[PDB]
Structure 1
Amino acid sequence: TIQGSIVAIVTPMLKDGGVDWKSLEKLVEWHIEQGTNSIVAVGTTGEASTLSMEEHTQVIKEIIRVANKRIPIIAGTGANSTREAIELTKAAKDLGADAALLVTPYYNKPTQEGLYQHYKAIAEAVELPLILYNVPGRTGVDLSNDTAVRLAEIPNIVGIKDATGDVPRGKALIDALNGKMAVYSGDDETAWELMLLGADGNISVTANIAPKAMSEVCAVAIAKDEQQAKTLNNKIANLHNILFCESNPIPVKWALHEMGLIDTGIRLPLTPLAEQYREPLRNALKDAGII
């Protein structure tokens, strides 16, 4: 049921890597003021990989606290162990998250049936809406449309974040599902098109730095206004490219630092955006009216 612009929020950090709680609070308030419809806490963009289990709980807890029921909060709770995904998803439920986002198991390369059993076990263990997340380039595995369609029959499986950026494939998935569960874009470059074709929203990186603009792109695309969607998306299209010059969230964190919103903290093995990309990124932000 969650629709619109759903920001995959960064986890602001101090220079030493510690979570920057004060900056986080201000970012959440800013998203709400600017029109962001929902926040994914501790997803890929929020450096789930380098936060401790305690830090994961704390970030989810703080975002929910600051949000104060104004928008729904989705907790990133994916793991490449089914046992661990259960524990994380249960924790999110207990914290009062509205849903959980669960990337396919990465690195261990389960079969399609293994993916099915993984999500089914989690759905049966935890009464919380669950959103699947497919991003083959990062995980080593591709949850097929066919497996996605099977999983949409499982109670508590309510959607999928499709980060393939393959529009014909995404449309085919939307059409096959016929409303049985939601489809979210996980590719900012093509999100506007997927929403025009029936996606429920965009779980967005670009929304981190252009929340008002992305909230508008999603509103018009969901409303099926093809021309407004093209026009509004065009204004920020360069941002969708430049935020991936190095692996996300490296560029988006630097963008936010240049906007004066967060400090430079980022956890190894990730690194601050390479010096050479900083001027080009400043130029793209200036071009789009962000700074």
Structure 2
Amino acid sequence: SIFKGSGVAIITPFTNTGVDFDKLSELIEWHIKSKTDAIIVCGTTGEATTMTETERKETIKFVIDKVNKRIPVIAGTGSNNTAASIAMSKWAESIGVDGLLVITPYYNKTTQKGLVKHFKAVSDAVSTPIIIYNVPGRTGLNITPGTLKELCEDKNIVAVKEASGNISQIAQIKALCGDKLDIYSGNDDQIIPILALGGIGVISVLANVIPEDVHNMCELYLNGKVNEALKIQLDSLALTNALFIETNPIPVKTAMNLMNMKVGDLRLPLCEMNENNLEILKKELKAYNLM
């Protein structure tokens, strides 16, 4: 597998004119010290959408180079344009990424037949492991377990980041694909049930603020200490849910700033939280002893 445990979907800290590389370096070092198992750079939580192609490439390369092989680095390389996804994926491979996080098409969408073609086209272009990212609440498109079954024997297609929230579906993926498709939770409030179904970790928002707890939750469960893992899930659940009270990464970035991490502002169309939601987030941060 690319990694097991907690993979942080790291934020991209911005200055008001670009990427705050000094801050990103600090976060990298902190994650390594905090037992984060992998870094996913330029995922959704990283605001790739609102970065230029040059910012994306510089940020991905920065993370790769700073991590310096200490943990795996996975880059978000997919888009809703297949040619573009191929080119970005080739690029990331060429500069030493350990894995590619490749979203389904979104907005334009496609059929299940088209999903097979899309993923096969990206895979055929590379020799690096691919994590399919299924997030229908954002993309409008659900890749089915049957379609995943058609893709999981592909040499490079090793895993899925399953953010559907549909636990039935995740059971079906495991039943059909087995070890041919590792499952990462794509929802922090669903780590335990997904690990219970044979998942191997999480690609996490929550790990941006409590990386060691997320790592520990996974490690405990995977080591059979299931009750101890569950306690972390439940004790962190209200905070976790507060991190989705508005579109991620609005809350997590807000939270990190509340925690004195100085990670800068969001890029439009993302923006500051409303008053009520900010107060819920503060409450849960305080209750978890984070501020």
- Fold shared per TM-score above 0.5: yes
Q: What is residue 42 of structure 1 aligned with on the other side?
A: 42
Structure 1 residue runs of 4+, over 6 Å off? none
Pair 1:209 & 2:226 matched? no
Counterpart of 2:258?
A: 258
CA distance in 2, matches of 1:110, 1:231: 40
Aligned to 1:199: 199
Structure 1 regions of 5+ residues with no counterpart?
none
Contact 1:171–1:197, Cα closer than 8 Å, also in 2 = yes
- Is the contact between residue 217 and residue 232 of structure 1 (CA under 8 Å) also seen in structure 2? yes
1:82-101 matches, within 5 Å, as 82-101=82-101
Cα distance in 1, alignment partners of residues 221 and 194 from structure 2: 8
- In structure 2, what is the Cα distance between the partners aligned to 1:24 and 1:273? 23
Indicate if the aligned counterparts of 1:193 and 1:221 stay in contact, CA closer than 8 A: no
Residue of structure 2 in register with 1:162 after alignment: 162
The match for 1:286 is 286
Give the drift of 1:279.
Answer: 2.8
CA deviations over 1:151-203 (Å, ceiling 9, x no partner): 00111011111101222221221122121121111011111111122101100
* 8 Å CA contact 1:4, 1:201 repeated in 2: yes
Deviation at 1:66, TM superposition (A): 1.7
Q: Alpha-carbon deviation of 1:44?
A: 0.4
Q: Distance in 1 between matches of 2:275 and 2:21?
A: 26
Matched, 1:241 2:249: no
Contact 1:6 1:203 in 2 (8 A): yes
Partner residue, 2:190: 190
* Cα distance between partner residues in 2 of 1:260 and 1:91: 35
Match of 1:269 in 2: 269
| Cα deviation 1:26-69 (Å, max 9, x = unaligned) | 01110110011001000000001111111111111111122121
Whether 2:17 is the aligned partner of 1:6: answer no
Q: Select between 60-69 and 130-139 the one with higher mean Cα deviation.
A: 60-69
- Distance in 1 separating the partners of 2:80 and 2:11: 21
| Residue 230 (structure 1) aligns with | 230
Structure 2 regions of 5+ residues with no counterpart? none
How far off its partner does 1:149 sit? 1.1
Q: TM-score, normalised by structure 2?
A: 0.97
Over the matched positions of the two proteins, sequence identity in percent amounts to: 41
Q: Which residue of 1 aligns with 2:22?
A: 22
Q: Within 1, Cα distance between the matches of 2:166 and 2:229?
A: 18
Separation in 2 of the partners of 1:82 and 1:246?
29
SS at match of 2:32: helix
Contact 1:17 1:265 in 2 (8 A): no
Alpha-carbon offset, residue 18 of structure 1? 2.0
In the TM superposition, what is the alpha-carbon distance from 1:17 to its structure 2 partner? 5.0
The answer to whether the 8 A contact 2:18-2:55 is kept is no
